[PDB]
Amino acid sequence: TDAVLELPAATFDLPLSLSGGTQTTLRAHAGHWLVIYFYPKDSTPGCTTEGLDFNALLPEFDKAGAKILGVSRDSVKSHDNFCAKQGFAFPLVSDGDEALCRAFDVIKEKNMYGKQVLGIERSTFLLSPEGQVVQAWRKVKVAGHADAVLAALKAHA
Ligand code: NA
Ligand code: NA
Ligand code: NA
After folding, report:
1. Active-site hit among 7, 47, 103, 133
2. Which of 36, 51, 79, 99 is disulfide-compatible with 19, CB 3.0–4.6 A?
């Protein structure tokens, strides 16, 4: 009823490689809210702006017991370098095989260059304590986004 997106059951048990060398799974986050934001490329202007915006709001997400994960298909080492340079205090998922991206249907196609070109569309989701995807943002506008996600989380919580 409250879900806006249905994920395959296996999605919740995918091993997600994090910055810092550990793995997580979505099921491991049971019992608390989770914000998952997908972005196209480490260390680019929009992605850096978005990450810094979420980072600045961490205490507000903490107040709500929520955790955040950023996701792109960059490597663990790329993510480590990005986190260290920017001072991020939340993890980044190295979704190199785009398994998590496909589950959330964020790999979108565009007819460009006389080709069918597939890429990550900037998108964010709110996962309830019982693992339901209860809100989505697609084709994200970075300006104001993290603030809007926080407001929606508060409203839902
Ligand atoms: Na960087
Ligand atoms: Na959760
Ligand atoms: Na929406």
Report:
1. 47
2. 79
